[PDB]
Write a protein that binds this ligand. Structure first.
Ligand SMILES: [Ca+2]
Lengths: 35, 258, 230, 230, 59, 35, 35, 51
């Protein structure tokens, strides 16, 4: 997703191409609510 | 249509609510935050090292101290001065008089569309030469470290230490370009566009974050100390956010009315 | 054996907007989780659809307009519909739109009366498509698209400017007044004079808000203007 | 026919950290087996988790501390918690940590009493999070996190410094005392004076060890400092 | 490992009539529909097959 | 179709290679009719 | 394994890319035991 | 010569690994070549006459 045109092939592994968050153990929704 | 604006929440309408009509088709989605920010842009222009350097001292520096200025560039959209983070952007409207002139930088587009409060994204860097047929290299070290300053003697030829190290160093052929991407490596979870805290527990300067950047970059000529030339050289730095995200709304700059 | 290939004329070129990635250098990094921060923004339209205060000249700028007591047939206030016009300059809709080239959808305007609870009156709001000369009287205003708004319990009243254009999409700046940039005028008329009981302040004030519509849309990003730093 | 392709802007570049291999030259070599060597190391944490001796000043350095006989309210000894501090310099935890940039987890400290078997006494160990000024008396020390250790049959006693930080990961060097580098102090208090029978040597000595915890972790390698060769 | 390859003698050449495309720069654009315009021309023979007036000399 | 020789492989996605018209909600036929 | 990003394709054979030992005919375990 | 980083992290006693080499010029626009021979040999020292 994003400004990325390729849709078929990825050479390097995901964990080397991107950063990841280590684990721990449609239409736009609105901001601001009234009740 | 009757409504109350004091409640803060107002529901968006269409033409058909009060008149005869119909709604328009979607169109395109060019406003997506991820798609908007993935474009390279100029950040700063720096000189090229030809010997071992001396990192600039902290800001309370008095006169007479010896160091090298304008050789290092920070990687951060926020304002900076003298290769160190700042809070207020600077500008020399009268280039005259004594004193060293302080380097400055800023990300005009990023702060023109900085509508939020917190930000996070990877970052891809590129460098380009501003001199005809130049040979150079680029070095980098992560946030929260320092640049080693010394040299070694090989065959009676001094060789600066920044040649070697387990943190990336890259070389380019005649007239070539250097490109690579970096991860988000700061200790903080997100980068604060605007801040109002203090880092040190006392004698701190409010609103000055400590580690809001990706790292630091510099360029050098792969030759020994014995070949210090006579003319200065410059390069240009390009950055491009990748897979960006935002977290909390804010306001935009104030466009002054003539 | 080696695969034989011939590079094209476009090689070693550096293109800023190219839609592709590059080679990593320092991979295998893992970052802290960010589940704890609420209110992630996914599209800037979420912010474009929030009303904000406009500006006018008091001759040196204020967001409101003071209702006079004199009687005259000219419109109380009238401004063009062009996102580059000063009135929309500081509002979010205009500020964001100045970074793009085209737009669609319906603009939205809102008002709020902040006078004494004891007052009573009526106002007329009209929107005039482009013409040789702009409207200058109630008789002319009545014919265009318009609505009647009366002071009562509720304080605010919303108005929608329909998207009536000779072509899909429209320019967001007016270098020259072609039909694709300017789209008429908006004007407010005081239908009846205000009634107040004795010993009350005169000349109440009215307030304006501007925001994007439901079916608003932008397109084709463009580089921004850095003059604000000076 | 030739496959047409266009090389990117990044070509002929030499990147030291690139995650990929290169072309072989002298392959097909077979080497002796190494099944006979025991104790293969798989991760340097295995070595980081081994206690070692710290250092102090006797004014010119020794690992132990001599318990005096005078009476005073100041802490017997106190040092900051910062991996770049001299006390941790030669210990394995500090030496290895100086080659990286961030860390997590809990540090561990251990003591051992090497006095005569006939002695008896008690000691107080405390850990103070950061403050404007460091603790200077038992009354202040009692409030922070602390524990009581008494001389008995067994000789050693372990203490764990909890990881209490405003952010995940912390810097391993202190260029300036931001809250992300320094993390308070550790101090030892003599609760009661030592009791010895007649005809025994005075001023026993106590010994220190420092090691990594169970959930210790490092990250983000960095280049090392070669000054040791001089 | 890197795939070894050898470019042919014809490299970096610019050929106007080459039957292939190039790299995009500003993609993801969407345009208005054109269903409303009638009389699309598909081949110029459609126009070549329409009679027209010739010319001669009146001198 | 057109002056395009490739018939096997496409790298970039269609929406990035070409422009598209957003939705709304053989022998040659002759031009000009008589009735 | 290691500082190697590729995870899909290998060109040269294993015995030419690496050296091998000729035959003859998880959590970290601790070092040093007491009994 | 010496390997400063390797001996700064030399926490063990025995070591084994393959090794990848690279060379780089320190002069502008130089033409050169590189040669190698395995452990436990010697470099031949003589020349031949061609034309
Ligand atoms: Ca090639």
């Amino acid at each position: 997703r994003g400004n990325n045109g390729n849709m078929t092939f990825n050479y390097y592994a995901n964990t080397y191409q991107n950063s990841v968050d280590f684990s721990t153990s449609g239409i736009l929704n609105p901001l601001g609510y009234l009740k | 249509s009757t409504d109350n604006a004091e409640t803060g929440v107002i529901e968006a309408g269409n033409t058909d609510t009060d008149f005869s009509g119909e709604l328009a088709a979607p169109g395109s989605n060019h406003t997506n935050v991820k798609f908007l920010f993935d474009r390279s842009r100029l950040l700063n222009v720096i000189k090229v090292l030809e010997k071992d350097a001396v990192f600039p001292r902290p800001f309370p520096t008095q006169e007479g101290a010896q160091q090298d200025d304008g050789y290092f560039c920070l990687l951060t959209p926020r304002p900076t001065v003298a290769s160190r983070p700042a809070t207020r952007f600077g500008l020399y409207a009268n280039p005259s008089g004594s004193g060293v002139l302080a380097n400055t930088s800023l990300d005009f587009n990023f702060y023109s569309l900085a509508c939020f409060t917190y930000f996070r994204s990877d970052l891809e860097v590129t460098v380009v030469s501003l001199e005809p047929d130049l040979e150079f290299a680029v070095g980098w070290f992560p946030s929260g470290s320092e640049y080693q300053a010394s040299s070694f003697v090989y065959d009676q030829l001094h060789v600066p230490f920044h040649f070697t190290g387990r943190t990336p160093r890259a070389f380019a052929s005649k007239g070539g370009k250097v490109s690579f991407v970096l991860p988000w490596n700061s200790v903080s979870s997100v980068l604060p566009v605007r801040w109002g805290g203090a880092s040190k527990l006392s004698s701190a300067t409010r609103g000055l974050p400590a580690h809001a950047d990706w790292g630091t970059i510099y360029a050098f000529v792969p030759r020994p100390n014995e070949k210090k030339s006579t003319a200065v050289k410059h390069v240009a730095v390009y950055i491009r956010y990748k897979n960006a995200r935002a977290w909390c709304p804010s306001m935009l700059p104030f466009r002054s009315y003539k | 054996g080696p695969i034989p290939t011939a590079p094209r004329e476009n090689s070693l070129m550096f293109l800023s907007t190219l839609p592709d990635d590059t080679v990593p250098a320092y991979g295998n990094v893992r970052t802290p989780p960010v589940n704890y921060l609420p209110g992630e923004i996914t599209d800037l339209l979420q912010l474009a659809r929030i009303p904000t205060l406009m500006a006018f000249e008091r001759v040196t700028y204020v967001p409101y307009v003071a209702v006079p007591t004199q009687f005259d047939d000219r419109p109380l206030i009238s401004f063009p519909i062009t996102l580059s016009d000063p009135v929309y300059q500081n509002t979010l809709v205009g500020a964001i739109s100045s970074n793009f080239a085209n737009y669609r959808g319906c603009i939205q305007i809102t008002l709020t009366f902040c006078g004494p609870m004891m007052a009573r009156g009526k106002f007329l709001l009209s929107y005039s498509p482009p013409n040789g000369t702009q409207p200058q009287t109630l008789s002319e205003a009545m014919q265009c698209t318009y609505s009647i708004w009366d002071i009562g319990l509720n304080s605010s009243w919303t108005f929608v400017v329909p998207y009536i254009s000779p072509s899909d999409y429209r320019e967001t700046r007016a270098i020259t007044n072609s039909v694709y940039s300017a789209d008429g005028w908006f004007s407010l008329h005081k239908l009846t004079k205000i009634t107040l009981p004795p010993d009350c302040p005169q000349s109440p004030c009215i307030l304006f808000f501007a925001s994007a519509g439901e079916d608003y849309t932008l397109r084709l990003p463009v580089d921004c203007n850095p003059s604000y730093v000076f």
